[PDB]
Scaffold this active site. Structure first.
Site, PDB file in Angstrom:
ATOM      1  CG  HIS A  68      -1.941  -1.094   1.188  1.00  0.00           C
ATOM      2  ND1 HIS A  68      -2.016  -2.144   1.786  1.00  0.00           N
ATOM      3  CD2 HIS A  68      -3.232  -0.949   0.242  1.00  0.00           C
ATOM      4  CE1 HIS A  68      -3.142  -2.807   1.472  1.00  0.00           C
ATOM      5  NE2 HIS A  68      -3.721  -2.345   0.370  1.00  0.00           N
ATOM      6  CG  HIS A  72      -1.606   0.220  -4.054  1.00  0.00           C
ATOM      7  ND1 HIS A  72      -2.479  -0.719  -4.780  1.00  0.00           N
ATOM      8  CD2 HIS A  72      -2.752   0.621  -3.369  1.00  0.00           C
ATOM      9  CE1 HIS A  72      -3.624  -0.758  -4.644  1.00  0.00           C
ATOM     10  NE2 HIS A  72      -3.789   0.005  -3.593  1.00  0.00           N
ATOM     11  CG  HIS A 106      -6.778   4.253  -2.992  1.00  0.00           C
ATOM     12  ND1 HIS A 106      -5.830   4.223  -3.637  1.00  0.00           N
ATOM     13  CD2 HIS A 106      -7.128   3.166  -2.642  1.00  0.00           C
ATOM     14  CE1 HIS A 106      -5.228   3.120  -3.928  1.00  0.00           C
ATOM     15  NE2 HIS A 106      -6.074   2.333  -3.396  1.00  0.00           N
ATOM     16  CG  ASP A 107      -4.528   2.460   0.110  1.00  0.00           C
ATOM     17  OD1 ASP A 107      -5.469   1.995   0.890  1.00  0.00           O
ATOM     18  OD2 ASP A 107      -4.393   1.706  -1.031  1.00  0.00           O
ATOM     19  CG  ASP A 217      -7.991  -0.757  -3.692  1.00  0.00           C
ATOM     20  OD1 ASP A 217      -6.711  -0.797  -3.913  1.00  0.00           O
ATOM     21  OD2 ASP A 217      -8.619  -0.843  -2.791  1.00  0.00           O
ATOM     22  CD  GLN A 269      -3.607 -14.213  -5.025  1.00  0.00           C
ATOM     23  OE1 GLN A 269      -3.887 -13.369  -5.829  1.00  0.00           O
ATOM     24  NE2 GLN A 269      -3.741 -13.715  -3.728  1.00  0.00           N
TER      25      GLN A 269
HETATM   26  C1  LIG Z   1      -4.349 -10.112  -5.633  1.00  0.00           C
HETATM   27  C2  LIG Z   1      -4.895  -9.283  -4.478  1.00  0.00           C
HETATM   28  N1  LIG Z   1      -5.098  -8.066  -4.687  1.00  0.00           N
HETATM   29  C3  LIG Z   1      -6.081  -7.300  -3.750  1.00  0.00           C
HETATM   30  C4  LIG Z   1      -6.278  -8.046  -2.509  1.00  0.00           C
HETATM   31  C5  LIG Z   1      -6.969  -7.219  -1.260  1.00  0.00           C
HETATM   32  N2  LIG Z   1      -5.658  -9.213  -2.221  1.00  0.00           N
HETATM   33  N3  LIG Z   1      -5.881 -10.137  -0.987  1.00  0.00           N
HETATM   34  C6  LIG Z   1      -5.377 -11.004  -1.432  1.00  0.00           C
HETATM   35  C7  LIG Z   1      -5.203 -12.516  -0.574  1.00  0.00           C
HETATM   36  C8  LIG Z   1      -6.029 -13.513  -1.219  1.00  0.00           C
HETATM   37  C9  LIG Z   1      -5.909 -14.567  -0.153  1.00  0.00           C
HETATM   38  N4  LIG Z   1      -4.726 -15.461   0.253  1.00  0.00           N
HETATM   39  C10 LIG Z   1      -5.358 -16.529   0.988  1.00  0.00           C
HETATM   40  C11 LIG Z   1      -4.411 -17.338   1.833  1.00  0.00           C
HETATM   41  C12 LIG Z   1      -3.126 -17.442   1.399  1.00  0.00           C
HETATM   42  C13 LIG Z   1      -2.201 -18.230   2.174  1.00  0.00           C
HETATM   43  C14 LIG Z   1      -2.793 -19.218   2.822  1.00  0.00           C
HETATM   44  C15 LIG Z   1      -4.017 -18.947   3.424  1.00  0.00           C
HETATM   45  C16 LIG Z   1      -4.951 -18.118   2.704  1.00  0.00           C
HETATM   46  C17 LIG Z   1      -6.665 -16.257   1.398  1.00  0.00           C
HETATM   47  N5  LIG Z   1      -7.211 -15.090   0.510  1.00  0.00           N
HETATM   48  C18 LIG Z   1      -8.514 -14.456   0.408  1.00  0.00           C
HETATM   49  N6  LIG Z   1      -4.766 -11.206  -2.614  1.00  0.00           N
HETATM   50  C19 LIG Z   1      -5.196 -10.070  -3.049  1.00  0.00           C
HETATM   51 MG   LIG Z   2      -6.802   0.712   0.969  1.00  0.00          MG
HETATM   52 ZN   LIG Z   3      -5.559   0.349  -2.434  1.00  0.00          ZN
END
Ligand SMILES: Cc1ncc(C)n2nc(CCc3nc(-c4ccccc4)cn3C)nc12
Ligand SMILES: [Mg+2]
Ligand SMILES: [Zn+2]
Length: 312
Positions: A68, A72, A106-107, A217, A269
């Site tokens: 952030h 970004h 925004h951040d 975002d 992901q």
């Molecule tokens: C690409 C991207 N753009 C923006 C945002 C806000 N994010 N947030 C994530 C995390 C996704 C994610 N990783 C995990 C996880 C990972 C390792 C172990 C267990 C769970 C769960 N989740 C939902 N990726 C993004």
């Molecule tokens: Mg934010």
């Molecule tokens: Zn942001």
């Protein structure tokens, strides 16, 4: 230096593309934002020196966190530029001014911690901002910079239009709270599938802007795979640093913020694309068809994450 900046002609062509990655041009980011502003809102909307003094103070007020950060902010501004450019007519001049500025701010002053952290561990910021903690602080930081000497880029506006732009900026910045997105997308899909969506309606308008702020975002997922994968690393670096603090307090963090659970990133992901990203750009393409390349690029990276899980 920034006042005497000129963009290479090769960048002018590729900046218009949705998938364009700003990463390789770190020194040109302030001047890239100026370029995008002038191409979107004309050359006369802001006083050059006020804008440049504002931009560099916005940069200074981003911390050196993994995700952030200044990078970004500019990346999120560019995606809006691309959306605005391909849908220029649907939005007003004042909306294009505020939304570009809003994405860039925004951040602002992001600490590298989620809203969950600040609230759960009674941080000062959680005391004065209940819901959408950091987001409200980001707008609060945006206004503070606007009230510095020679920074008020909106000073030449009428008091009416001044109050209008701040409320577009405020709404835009609050909308980037991912907690509010899920509700916002649901209604917008409902308004589309029924045929009841209407851009003359202010609340519908604010909801569409809100979705655009989410799409922007999250746009790292709409870039070419190597850029998407690299930025993913920066994201988890920030999450894992936050989980370490929770661990230092004995508390086990959620899997996402646990570096010991790095194995489940591809699966994590895969869920993020299915639950958040794909639905985000799907609804956005239905409302704004020229934004379709964002969905295409997201789909490609979805299959890449599927490819990573299968061991390929
Ligand atoms: C690409 C991207 N753009 C923006 C945002 C806000 N994010 N947030 C994530 C995390 C996704 C994610 N990783 C995990 C996880 C990972 C390792 C172990 C267990 C769970 C769960 N989740 C939902 N990726 C993004
Ligand atoms: Mg934010
Ligand atoms: Zn942001």
């Amino acid at each position: 230096g920034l006042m005497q900046f000129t963009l290479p002609v090769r960048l002018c062509k590729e900046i218009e593309l949705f998938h364009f990655d700003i990463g390789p041009f770190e020194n040109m980011w302030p001047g890239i934002f100026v370029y995008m502003v002038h191409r979107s809102c004309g050359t006369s909307c802001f006083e050059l020196e006020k804008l440049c003094r504002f931009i560099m103070s916005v940069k200074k007020n981003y911390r050196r966190v993994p995700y952030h950060n200044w990078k970004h902010a500019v990346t999120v501004a560019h995606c809006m530029y691309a959306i605005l450019q391909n849908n220029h007519t649907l939005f007003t001049d004042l909306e294009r001014k505020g939304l570009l500025i809003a994405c860039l701010c925004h951040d602002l002053d992001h600490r590298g911690f989620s809203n969950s952290y600040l609230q759960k561990f009674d941080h000062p910021l959680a005391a004065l901002y209940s819901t959408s903690t950091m987001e409200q602080h980001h707008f609060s930081q945006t206004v503070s910079i606007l009230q510095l000497e020679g920074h008020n880029i909106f000073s030449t506006l009428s008091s009416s239009e001044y109050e209008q732009v701040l409320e577009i900026i405020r709404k835009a910045i609050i909308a980037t709270d991912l907690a509010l997105y899920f509700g916002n997308r649901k209604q917008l899909e409902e308004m589309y599938q029924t045929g009841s969506l209407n851009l003359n309606n202010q609340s519908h308008r604010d909801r569409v802007i809100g979705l655009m702020m989410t799409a922007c975002d999250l746009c790292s997922v709409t870039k070419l795979w190597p850029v998407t994968k690299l930025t993913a690393n920066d994201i988890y670096a920030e999450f894992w640093a936050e989980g370490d603090e929770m661990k230092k307090l004995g508390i086990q963090p959620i899997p996402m913020m646990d570096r010991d659970k790095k194995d489940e990133v591809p699966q994590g992901q895969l869920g993020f694309y299915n639950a958040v990203a794909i639905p985000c750009y799907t609804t956005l393409t239905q409302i704004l068809p020229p934004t379709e390349p964002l969905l295409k690029a997201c789909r490609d990276n979805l299959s890449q994450w599927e490819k990573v899980i299968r061991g390929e």
